[PDB]
Structure formats: C-alpha cells, structure tokens
C-alpha cells in the first residue's frame, strides 16, 4: 500500500535542497508549474522516495519565495498534561516558548483519533463531528499575533525565539506551532490515549490557510481540512490574477506572507517556480478535503477549484485519488458548512481519521466550474511507481 501518514514531521529532511534561482532568472511558466518536475528542470518524479524529495523541493521553494523557513524541531521539548490542559515548553538556542491548550479527552481506554482546530477545538466544524475525538485547540497567538493590518508584531513569542525570522510570514510561525503541539501530544500519548496515526487539522478562512500550511508542512497529519481558505490558501496565485478583486499577490497582507513575494512577483506570477496547487500536493499521499463558498467572491473559488484539480493530479499519479476530495457550494454563511459539506467531509473523517471502511471514491462536487485543463494540459496523467 501507499502510506496514509508517517511517523515523522518530515520524512525527507535528508533530501538535497533544490536550486533556487533569483526571481529575475526564473523562467516564465505561465500556466501551472509541473509538480513532478524537479526544481532543476532535469526530469520527473519516478517513485515514492522521489516524491518525498520533490515534496521537500516544493517546501523549500515556498519557504524561499513567500513564507520563510520553518525551523527544524527544537533542541528540547517538554510536554505535560495536568488539569485538562496540555502545556508544551520549547527550548532552542537559548530561547523558550510555551504553548498551552485546554484539550478534551473522550472516555475509555482508547486510543482516540485527534483533531487540532485553529483557535478552538474542531475549528469551525461542529463539536458533534468530532464528539469521539481528542480535541486540541491551537491558540495561534501564542506563536504569532493574528491581525488584519498588513503589519507584523515582532514581539510575539515566536519572533522572540527566532528574531532573525522577523521577515518570515506568520503562516510559518503557525505551521511550526502546530508541529510543536503534535510533538507534545506524542510525549503525553499514553496518558491521554492518543492515536498518532489519526490526527486531523481543520480551520476556516484565515484558519483554513493555517490548516493548509499546518498539514502540508507536517507528515504526521493524516487528514488536512481547510475550510473556505480563499486567496493565499488553496487558490493558485496565477489563476487568481486572471479573475478580479480576489485575495492575490496584489492585495494580500505581507505579515502572513513575506513582502518578497509582492516585490519579486507582483504582476509576474508566471515567474514563480511553484504555485499553491503544489502546496496542496505537499499533503500527498495523505488525505485531503476542502470546502468552498462561491457566494463570497473574495474567496476566488474558480482559482481554488482550478488549483484543487491541479493538486489532485499528484494523488492520481500515485493511484490514491480517493484520498482527495472537496465540495464547492453556495447557500451557506461563510465558515458554516452547507448540509452537503457536513456530509461529504464526514465520509472523510470516518475513513481517514476514524478508520471505518467508508468509500470516498469521487467526491469532487462543485457548483463552481473553470477551464482547469487549460492550466495543467502540458503535464497531466503522469503516474508514479509505488514499489
């Protein structure tokens, strides 16, 4: 079989860093870059061990051009569970940072699957969809302060611990904090009966982008569920440039992302060696399900829909396309899932987090349409050898 999840945050840390051309020497790839093409233009992924390194090239490209580098695991990490609260103490190069979450543990001997919500248990999905889960809220402000002015708070605890990261995007702090939570859950696992092979992550809107980066950048996340992530999330920068008045390089904020993206690629997103379809593909071969809301134009769902279809090619290539699913539909308020969305994702929570043999074969339901073949025609229908 193809792994559904991995024991380590990054199985490909041993891979060789890709070439990273200066922005002005970057080729103009006007449609969506080829996710299987090595960063140096020298061919295409062949097997699973290759995909891990291509995943790490995508990671390195996203870190280099728009987020900043996720720190490696810290030198020291101590987690404790007392009074319903998990507290995680991080030590690295003479600094400290502490995370604290009020978690809720199901009754019984276990083990229990895990759901990490952004700023809440279960995020913007209902507690009922995870009534049988360990529920761990990620209080993101304990790493970087959420805000919607395009300005950064360099005194937040992450930036105090890595002061030379004050140019990095806030999404790299948040991804790193989610990986520190999972570190602490691992440490206390036998005490709360956590099943480390069934951890999910979810959030909506800004919290949707947070969940996308969080699970893309951590291979111990067995199901990544961004909800209405919009521009800067599942949406491709390129396609969002072709539609109008959406979140895109021109108007997003440059504290969550690096100012370098605007300065080097605004009006020239064809020059990016990557796009966000490959951010989604960093989750492959693990399970992925996302929700759209075309009723809000600011989310740019034609770009999200397009980029999701592009990402699916990576699951197809590995013969696991039933681990990828979405649902685009209107008729619901932002961050409150439509009825069909609650049902669709519940099939994914059952199979990939609860372990039931539900089927998930073709859940690509969307009231949004777009010429997505136009964006992926060059590279498409590739396949990878799975041993």
Residue numbers in the entry: 22 to 408
Publication excerpt:
Glucuronoyl esterases (GEs) within the carbohydrate esterase family 15 (CE15) esterase family, in a range of aerobic and anaerobic fungi and bacteria, have been identified as playing an important role in breaking down LCCs by cleaving the ester bond between 4-O-methyl-d-glucuronyl in xylan and alcohol groups in lignin.
Crystals of PrCE15 belonged to space group P61 with a single protein molecule in the asymmetric unit. The structure of PrCE15 was refined to Rwork/Rfree of 22.9%/26.9% using data with a maximum resolution of 2.54 Å. A similar examination of these resides in PrCE15 putatively identifies the catalytic residues as Ser226, His355, and Glu249. The catalytic residues of FsCE15 and PrCE15 are positioned in the canonical conformation characteristic of CE15-B subfamily with the general acid located on a loop at the end of β7. The arginine following the catalytic serine in the motif contributes to the stabilization of the transition state, and while the arginine is conserved in FsCE15 it is replaced with a tyrosine in PrCE15. Interestingly, it was more common for this residue to be tyrosine in AGF GEs (26 out of 35 sequences) with arginine found at this position in the nine remaining rumen enzymes. PrCE15 displayed a multiphasic unfolding curve however, upon reduction of the disulfide bond, PrCE15 unfolding was monophasic with the higher Tm unfolding event no longer detectable. We determined apparent steady state kinetic parameters for PrCE15 and RfCE15.
